[PDB]
Amino acid sequence: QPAHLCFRSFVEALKVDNDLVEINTPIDPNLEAAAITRRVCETNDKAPLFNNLIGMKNGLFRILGAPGSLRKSSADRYGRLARHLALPPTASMREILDKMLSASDMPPIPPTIVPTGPCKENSLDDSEFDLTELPVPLIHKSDGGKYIQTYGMHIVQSPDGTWTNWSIARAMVHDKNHLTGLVIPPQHIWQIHQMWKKEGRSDVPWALAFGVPPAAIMASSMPIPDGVTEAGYVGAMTGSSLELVKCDTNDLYVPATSEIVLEGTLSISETGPEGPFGEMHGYIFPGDTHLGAKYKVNRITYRNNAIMPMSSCGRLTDETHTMIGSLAAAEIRKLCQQNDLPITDAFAPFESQVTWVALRVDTEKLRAMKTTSEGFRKRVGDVVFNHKAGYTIHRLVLVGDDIDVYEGKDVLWAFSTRCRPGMDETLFEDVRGFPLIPYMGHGNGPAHRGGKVVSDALMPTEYTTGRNWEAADFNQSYPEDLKQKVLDNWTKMGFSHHHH
Amino acid sequence: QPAHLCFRSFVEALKVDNDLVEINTPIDPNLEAAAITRRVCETNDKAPLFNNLIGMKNGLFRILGAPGSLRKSSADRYGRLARHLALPPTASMREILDKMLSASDMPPIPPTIVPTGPCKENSLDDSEFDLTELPVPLIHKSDGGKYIQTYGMHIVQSPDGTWTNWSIARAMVHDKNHLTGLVIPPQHIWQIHQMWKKEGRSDVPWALAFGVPPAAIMASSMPIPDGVTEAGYVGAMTGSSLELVKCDTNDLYVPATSEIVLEGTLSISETGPEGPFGEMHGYIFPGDTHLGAKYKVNRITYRNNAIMPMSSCGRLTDETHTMIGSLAAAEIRKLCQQNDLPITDAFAPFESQVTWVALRVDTEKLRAMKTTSEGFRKRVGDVVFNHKAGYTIHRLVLVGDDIDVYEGKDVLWAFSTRCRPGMDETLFEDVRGFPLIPYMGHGNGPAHRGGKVVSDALMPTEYTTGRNWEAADFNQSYPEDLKQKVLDNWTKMGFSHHHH
Ligand SMILES: Cc1cc2c3c(c1C)C(C)(C)C[C@H]1C(C(=O)O)=C(c4ccccc4)[C@]4(C(=O)NC(=O)N=C4N2C[C@H](O)[C@H](O)[C@H](O)COP(=O)(O)O)N31
Numbered sequence A, B: 001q002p003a004h005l006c007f008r009s010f011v012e013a014l015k016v017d018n019d020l021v022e023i024n025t026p027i028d029p030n031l032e033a034a035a036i037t038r039r040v041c042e043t044n045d046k047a048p049l050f051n052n053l054i055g056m057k058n059g060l061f062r063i064l065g066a067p068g069s070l071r072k073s074s075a076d077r078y079g080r081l082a083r084h085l086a087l088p089p090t091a092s093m094r095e096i097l098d099k100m101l102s103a104s105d106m107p108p109i110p111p112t113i114v115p116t117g118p119c120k121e122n123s124l125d126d127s128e129f130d131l132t133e134l135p136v137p138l139i140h141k142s143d144g145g146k147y148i149q150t151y152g153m154h155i156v157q158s159p160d161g162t163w164t165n166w167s168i169a170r171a172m173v174h175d176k177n178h179l180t181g182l183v184i185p186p187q188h189i190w191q192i193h194q195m196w197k198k199e200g201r202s203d204v205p206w207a208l209a210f211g212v213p214p215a216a217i218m219a220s221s222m223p224i225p226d227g228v229t230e231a232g233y234v235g236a237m238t239g240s241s242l243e244l245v246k247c248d249t250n251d252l253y254v255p256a257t258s259e260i261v262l263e264g265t266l267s268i269s270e271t272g273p274e275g276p277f278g279e280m281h282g283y284i285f286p287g288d289t290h291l292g293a294k295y296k297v298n299r300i301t302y303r304n305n306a307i308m309p310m311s312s313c314g315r316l317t318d319e320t321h322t323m324i325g326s327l328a329a330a331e332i333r334k335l336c337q338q339n340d341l342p343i344t345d346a347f348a349p350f351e352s353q354v355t356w357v358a359l360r361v362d363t364e365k366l367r368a369m370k371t372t373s374e375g376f377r378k379r380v381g382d383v384v385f386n387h388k389a390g391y392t393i394h395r396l397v398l399v400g401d402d403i404d405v406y407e408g409k410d411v412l413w414a415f416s417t418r419c420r421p422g423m424d425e426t427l428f429e430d431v432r433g434f435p436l437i438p439y440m441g442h443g444n445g446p447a448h449r450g451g452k453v454v455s456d457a458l459m460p461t462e463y464t465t466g467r468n469w470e471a472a473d474f475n476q477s478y479p480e481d482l483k484q485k486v487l488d489n490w491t492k493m494g495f496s497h498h499h500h
C-alpha cells in the first residue's frame, strides 16, 4: 500500500529515505522515548522508531516519534510532510500547501467501505484491556497524565449523520477505560459535541484511530470548512477513495490500515482532570489542571506489531509547528482570496512560534483597489480573525511581493523595517483569542478574547505608484554581469553543496 | 604595535587568524570591491583586502572590506570585534560589551602627543590632490555619490576646547576638495556643529582619520556620554594613553598610525547634495537626495601603502549591525542600571535589523519593586527613549532571567509568546524617532517623532511570586540523569564539533 495511504508503509518510506533510527533495545515510555524524540525535534534528526518499549504487551505497542518534523538538510527539509502526500521529498512548502488546498474546489471522493483490514488483526474487549497497563508515554516531566493521544485522529459525526469530522486533539489516560482531553471552541470536535449535548439523548459515538493514512492525519490537522467531511476531502486530494472499515461496537468507520483503534463514547455530561501539558508554544504550567472532556473506551482493535505515532511537542520544531501553523496558513490564504483580498501566499513563521501569519500581497492588485493601510488592515483582520481558520493566529503581517513568506528571516526583516509600531497596526480586542498562548491564558487580560493585531509591513507607495526602493543587498544593489563575475571568481579569489 | 592600537597591525592579525583574503589582481572601486564585500558580509566569509585597486595612484589607496563583520564559525563568531580590543578571538558578546563599558567608571587616560608617526609618511597639499581622482568606491549601484567615508573617524572639538569627539558618520565626495555627509541630531558631531554655528565666527576645524586604532573606531561607533572625549575613554579601556600627532593645517590631533588623514573644515553655512545611500536597515531609496553638511579638505596625509577600511553596509550582517546595534545596547544596559532599573543585559537582535533591544530583567529585583507591567514599561521607555543612547532603537523587549538576550531565537520566542499585542505594550509618540528606518523617513507618519514601543515579555507572576512555568524543551522538561543518558547514548543509538 502507498506510503501516503498506509502508516505502516510510511514508516518503511522513512527507513528507505535514511530518515529513521530503529531502537531495538528497551526504552522507557516514562519520559525516555519523548526525551529522545524531543532532542530529535530540536536538532532536525531522523525520526525514532522504538521497537522495544518497556511495558509493551500482546502487541501494544511500538512508538514512532517526530512523524511530521523537519529534516536537517535544506533540500529535503519538509520531506517527512512530502511523504504524507505522495510528493517528491524535495517538495517546497508552497507545493505542500497547494496539495493540501487542492481538494477545496474539487468534488469530494467519498470513502469506500471494505469488510476488514489490518486494524482488525487483534482485539480487546472491555474485560481484556486496561489503559493504565499499556506503555502510554509521559511526554514532559510535569504533564498531568500520560498522553496516549498526540497523533491519532478523533472521529465524530453530527447527530443527523451528514458530517463526519476527523481531527487531532490531545488526550490522556484517566483510568482503565477512560481518557480526558481538550475539546474547545471553535474546534469541530467541540462543534459536534455541542450538537449532541443540545440533542440531550446520548453520549457521542466516538473512535480514535492511531497510525492512520498519512494524507488523512494531514487533513485532520487542517481547519477545512465547517460541515466538510475530511474523508472525502482527502479522497479528492489523493485522487483515491479511502478504504474504511466499520467499528465493532458502533457504526463509525475507521481507516482499514489504522495501527490502533479505540471505540467508545465522548460524554455529553461528564468531565475529568486534564492537563497540564507541554504545549505547542513551548511551555507547561505545572499544576494547571482543568476539567476536560471525558471519553469512555469500550473496545481496542489493532494491527499485529502495532505502532503508535507520538508528537513530543514544545519548542521548535515539531508537528505542532510544521502542521498546525502551516496548514492554518494555507486555509487563511484561500480564505483571503475568496474574500477578494489580493493575497498570493501565507505562512506561519516558525520564529513566531506559529503565532504570526505573513500574508504576501499582490501589490499590482492592491494598487488598483485605491485604498489605504488603515482600511486594508481592517478588512484583512475582519476576514481572518472572525473565522475559525484564524483562531490560532494572533498577528498578521502584510508584506509586498518582494518578500518570500516561507523565509522567516525575510519576514522578520520586512516586519522590523516596514511596519511602524502603533501607527501601521490595528488591534482587535473583540475577536476570539487563542488561550493556549501564554500571554492569553496565563496573561494580563481575558484568556479567550482579543490580543490580536494586523501589522502592515507594506510601504506607502505600495498602495499608490509602486515600490520605491532597492534592497541594499548583493542581489539588488549590483548589476547582473557584476554579480555573475563575482560568483564565477569567488573560489579563485580564495573565498568559500545544495544536497548536503 | 598591538593590533588593537594600530590598523596596520590589525590587518596582519586578520591574516594570522586565517580571516583575510588578499586580492592582488585589479579590482574596480566602481561596485566590484563593494559587491565582493557585500557577499562576504551576507555569508560571514573572510575579510577582503584589495591590494590592486583600479585608480590607486601614489599610494592612495588599498581597501579592507568587512572589518567588523562576522566569522562563519560559532566559536569565534565575533572574532573580528575581539581583535579590535585585545580580547581572545572566542570572546562572547557579553565580554566584548563589558570591555566597551569598562571605561565608564574609570578615570580617563588622556592621549599623549608625539611629534610624528606613520600617518605623516606622505602628504598632498591643496594643489596636489583631487578627491574625484582617487579610487573612492561606489558601494551600492543607486548611491548618490562615491562614499569615501564608511569606517573612518571624524574629529571635531567644542569651541571652548574642552570636548573632542570621535565618531563615525558617512560622507561622500562632492568635488575635488569637498565631501558631503550626514550630520544629524542628536549625534555628537551635530551637537558640536551647533555650538560653532551659534558662535557664528568660523567653520569647524575638522579632521577625518581612516584606518585608526581599532579600539578607537569601536568607541567612535558607541554613544558614550555627551561631553566625554573618546580618546580618554579608549585610553582607560585599553589601559594605555593613545599616541596622537598634530594635524599640519589645524590644531586637532589624529592617531599617529592613521592610514589616511583628511584635514579641513566642516562648514557652518554651506550644504550640498548628499545621498541616497544603501543604509543599515537594508534599503536605498534611489533618487532620495537631500542636502547634507559640507566639508572642505585642505590637506591629505597618509601612510606608505595606505589602506582604506570600507563598510559595504545593508542587509545582514555588517558593521552597522554588529557595532551600531551592539554598542547602543551596551550603553542602554548601563543607562538602565544607572536609573535603578533591574536590567542585567541588553542586545539588539540582528533579526530585528538592530531596531529592537532586548533587556534581560533581574526578576528577583523586579519582584521587590512591587510594581506592574504598565508602570514598569513606562519607566523603562521614559529612561531609554528620552536619551541619545536610545535614538536608533524603536522597540524594547523586556524579558525575564531565563532568556539569553544575545540569542535572537530565544528573544523571538519570548516576544512572540509572552507579550500580548497592545495590552502588554506602551507606545511612545512624543520621543525622537530614527528617520533612517524606512517606516519612519519613508513611512506614514512624522519622520523624526514617535513610532517607539516598549513590549513587555515578562509574564505576570514574574512581577509577584516567581516564574510559574517550565519550558517544553529538552533542557527543562526532563530530569538531569535522563538527559545525560540520552546524550551519552545518542551516537550509539544511530543519531548525529564546537570549533568547526
Ligand atoms: C498536529 C497537531 C494538532 C493539534 C494538536 C497536536 C498536534 C500534533 C497535539 C500534539 C496533540 C497538541 C495539541 C494542542 C496543544 O498544543 O496542546 C492543540 C491545540 C492546537 C491548536 C488549537 C487548539 C489546541 C491540539 C489539541 O489538543 N486540541 C485542538 O483542538 N487542536 C489541536 N491540534 C490542532 C487541530 O488538529 C487543528 O486545529 C485542526 O484544524 C482541528 O480539526 P478541525 O476538524 O476541528 O478543523 N493538539
Ligand SMILES: Cc1cc2c3c(c1C)C(C)(C)C[C@H]1C(C(=O)O)=C(c4ccccc4)[C@]4(C(=O)NC(=O)N=C4N2C[C@H](O)[C@H](O)[C@H](O)COP(=O)(O)O)N31
Residues within 6 Å of the ligand: B149, B150, B151, B165, B166, B167, B168, B169, B170, B171, B182, B183, B184, B186, B187, B188, B189, B220, B221, B222, B223, B224, B277, B278, B279, B280, B281, B311, B313, B319, B320, B323, B324, B392, B436
Ligand atoms: C559603525 C558605523 C556607524 C555609523 C555609520 C556607519 C558605520 C559603519 C556607516 C557605514 C558609515 C553608515 C552610516 C549610517 C547609515 O546607516 O547610513 C549611519 C547612521 C546610523 C545610526 C544613526 C544615524 C545614522 C552613520 C552615519 O552616517 N551617521 C551617524 O550619525 N551615525 C552613523 N553611525 C553611527 C554612529 O557612529 C554612532 O551613533 C555613534 O554613537 C556616534 O558617535 P557619537 O560620538 O555621536 O556618540 N553611519
Ligand SMILES: [K+]
Residues within 6 Å of the ligand: A166, A167, A168, A219, A220, A221, A222, A223, A224, A230
Ligand atoms: K481537520
Ligand SMILES: [K+]
Residues within 6 Å of the ligand: A418, A419, A420, A424, A456, A457, A458, A459, A460, B439
Ligand atoms: K507600513
Ligand SMILES: [K+]
Residues within 6 Å of the ligand: B166, B167, B168, B219, B220, B221, B222, B223, B224, B230
Ligand atoms: K562615539
Ligand SMILES: [K+]
Residues within 6 Å of the ligand: A439, B418, B419, B420, B424, B456, B457, B458, B459, B460
Ligand atoms: K507580558
Ligand SMILES: [Mn+2]
Residues within 6 Å of the ligand: A165, A166, A167, A188, A223, A224, A225, A228, A230
Ligand atoms: Mn473539520
Ligand SMILES: [Mn+2]
Residues within 6 Å of the ligand: B165, B166, B167, B188, B223, B224, B225, B228, B230
Ligand atoms: Mn561622542
